[PDB]
Amino acid sequence: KEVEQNSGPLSVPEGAIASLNCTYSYRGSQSFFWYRQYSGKSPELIMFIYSNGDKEDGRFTAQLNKASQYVSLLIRDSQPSDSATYLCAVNFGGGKLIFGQGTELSVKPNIQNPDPAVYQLRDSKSSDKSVCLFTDFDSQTNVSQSKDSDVYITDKCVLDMRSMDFKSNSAVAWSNKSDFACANAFNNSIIPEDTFFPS
Amino acid sequence: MIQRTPKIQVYSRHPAENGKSNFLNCYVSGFHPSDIEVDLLKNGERIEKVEHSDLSFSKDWSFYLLYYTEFTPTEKDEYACRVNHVTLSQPKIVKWDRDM
Amino acid sequence: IAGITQAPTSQILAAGRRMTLRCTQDMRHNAMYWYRQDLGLGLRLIHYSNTAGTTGKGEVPDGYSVSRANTDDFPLTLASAVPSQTSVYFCASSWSFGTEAFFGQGTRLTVVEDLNKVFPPEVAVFEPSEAEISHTQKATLVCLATGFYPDHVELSWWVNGKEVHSGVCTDPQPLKEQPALNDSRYALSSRLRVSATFWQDPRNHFRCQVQFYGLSENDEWTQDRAKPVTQIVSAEAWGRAD
Amino acid sequence: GSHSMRYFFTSVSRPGRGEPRFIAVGYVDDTQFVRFDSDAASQRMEPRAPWIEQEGPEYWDGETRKVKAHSQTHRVDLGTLRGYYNQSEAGSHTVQRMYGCDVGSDWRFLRGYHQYAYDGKDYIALKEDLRSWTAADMAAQTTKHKWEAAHVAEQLRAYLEGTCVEWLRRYLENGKETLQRTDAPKTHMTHHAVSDHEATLRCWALSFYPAEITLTWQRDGEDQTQDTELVETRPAGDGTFQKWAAVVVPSGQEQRYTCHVQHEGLPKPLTLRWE
Amino acid sequence: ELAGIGILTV
């Protein structure tokens, strides 16, 4: 039947309190579950709840309101390793365990030093198959794709150097045979201010 | 394996009155196991349209059932309940007594 | 240690062929479940079973068989495999009906009408910029996996024969080469960023490793190229002091 | 003023062949409201009181799935107990399950229970605290350990303190007309002589609701726990109940005895004697 | 309302 969660993707800053909700039709429902799914992995139980009220489990708080057909999940003190899709499951009788659609969550890295730059990298299996990198932009900058059908740019991705306590977000673009430059690569979504170009 | 023999009471839904519609009841209780045969007799013959409640049970686990049928009592007609259970060598008959 | 297992973890199907996903469980759980997941529709319940010997229809029974001869097993079956059934399939189990369901690892299943449309990844490595090194004293190698269908791909970074999980990030999901054309092939990018010194040491070995899941070894391959089987395709780059 | 919801389940193996019988019935106080019968045709949970009918399809689908789930559980149970007790498969056997909850006058939780019988004797019961188990025998210990490891008791306690109570309140309000009525017992009195010098004398209580009642016998206002015959409260088949109490007494002092009737539908106790 | 939890095989 009907299990409905908040429409994702949501974005929460690091260390902040995150909050997911779930509403269900059947008033007779007696068991409620919250699962965590990383990309291409299997749903893993965060917690369960049977009764009206609160359930505390470390950084997590479940909240159930039978009268309002409602379940809630509260992440205190957010880690970036909570960046994952979150699933609400409710039982509608016997084996009828139904899942929500999933709210996709993404915790933003706190960028310690925004140095927005675009570099060019050459190949090993030759030289000419060309690729352009975008790096060290603040979390406030987004990236878009709509060039030709030829030029591919990926979404932003955050890496973490644990030995140097450093964090970098980056996006990669390419289009093989082309007159594809670096200045014209990330302009479908305008590039930030001090966007360092080497030439 | 403990077996328990049914108690049996025959009676009417309302106080009996000649020419006036009523219900004849046979309430069997306190029996185990659940398998039981119950007939309502009019002048010793099986009455065919008899209904019964759904099998339930009491705190001691013994079953009860109410068997019943629509009837119109006359002065001359005799009514009975016949019960057969594994605890019984032969069916048991209890006559309806209105002046109880 | 008691748990729950699916098999296979990956499968490519020719349309019309029949298929059974194994799922087994040694936890003495009474209740078991099959679900599908699709890239936007969350999990949808296919069949379920409350106890050994009994079964029931979920939200999407439509298409698949199922059986529960005993407690341990709960195989899911596809008679005629349509391409609409391409999904990820999960088996889960719970103690009794209404208690927490424990999931198995999953099975990625892709149904195609034609097996000639399956393709391995080409893998390239791209060595960092001198500008990056002379601006932020970091060095980013990027790996590209290109021209593969379907997206049964797993990418990892190896330095000196040892896998790393730091300074690395990969696109959560592959990126269609032709986002319109049918049966289009995919691409995956990844970034590995390490210090100026680490890159400049010419003794350091870097390898981008792509595990692709392709054809079973028993398949009917007919074409002029090699059988696009399950394989690892890698590309390398070495340290440059220049 | 107090109330109760209870569910009763009977599962009976009919061996040599196959397919056990399962009957489930549900009661609010002394009123049956739902039932399921595995031998009937619908294979669904069925209404047996006027006020439960207005409930929607999600309710009935829900209750059906849950009740089928109960039977399937019991069906595994029959094999299992058969194994536990080294019984052959030629004999018919019985599993019974009773659960539910009691509320006070204000409809706040008073007590809960879940009890389980095999072949009509106690097998395992949830204790009053709803956190622990009574295992009647050695074989039942196995079940106990399994239920402890699987946290059955916490789940039952959630049902019994939450869902049961809540839904009881819903049923009582929805079924206000039927459930919250009290029918005053109509009383009368019969006399039948047994042996010239002796006579049997019987006090009749009719058409009362709920079933709880008190029929007692006094002589000169004095307790008679001795010579008394007291028959089980029985259904009239119309929603009410009937009962009686008789005493055997030597002829001549039929005015030295009084029968006392206590019921909540009554303003004050009724004491009757002969005319 | 039937129990939807806590009903486990013996």
Numbering used by the authors:
A (entry chain D): 1 to 199
B (entry chain B): 0 to 99
C (entry chain E): 4 to 245
D (entry chain A): 1 to 275
E (entry chain C): 1 to 10
Task: Copy the relevant paper text.
T cell receptors (TCRs) are key elements of adaptive immunity, as they specifically recognize antigenic peptides bound to MHC proteins (pMHCs) on cell surfaces and are responsible for initiating immune responses against targeted cells. The αβ TCR DMF5 was originally isolated from tumor infiltrating lymphocytes present in a patient with metastatic melanoma. DMF5 recognizes the 27–35 nonameric and 26–35 decameric peptide epitopes from the MART-1 melanoma antigen presented by the class I MHC protein HLA-A*0201 (HLA-A2), and was the second TCR to be used in clinical trials of genetically engineered T cells. Here we explored the use of structure-based computational design to enhance TCR affinity, which in principle can permit control over both specificity and affinity gains.
Combining the affinity-enhancing αD26Y and βL98W mutations (this double mutant is referred to as YW) yielded a substantial improvement towards ELA/HLA-A2. Here, however, we measured a 400-fold improvement (from 9.5 µM to 24 nM). As with other structurally characterized TCRs engineered for high pMHC affinity, the docking orientation was conserved when compared to the wild-type complex, with a TCR-pMHC crossing angle of 32°, versus 33° for the wild-type. Essentially no perturbations of the interface CDR loops or peptide were observed (0.34 Å backbone atom RMSD for TCR and pMHC residues within 10 Å of the binding interface), indicating that our relatively conservative design strategy of selecting point substitutions against a fixed pMHC structure did not substantially alter the interface or proximal side chains. As anticipated from our modeling, both the tyrosine and tryptophan mutant side chains directly contact the MART-1 peptide in the αD26Y/βL98W structure, and make more extensive peptide contacts than their wild-type counterparts. These mutations led to a 5% increase in buried solvent accessible surface area for the pMHC, from 1059 Å2 to 1113 Å2. Unexpectedly, as explicit water molecules were not used in our structural modeling or scoring, a water-mediated hydrogen bond to the peptide was introduced between the mutant residue αY26 and the side chain of the N-terminal glutamate of the peptide, in addition to a direct hydrogen bond between side chains. This polar network may explain the superior affinity of αY26 versus αW26 for ELA/HLA-A2, despite the fact that they were predicted to be similar (ZAFFI) or αW26 was preferred (Rosetta). No binding was detectable towards HLA-A2 presenting the Tax or gp100 peptides, even at concentrations more than 25-fold higher than those used to characterize binding to wild type DMF5.
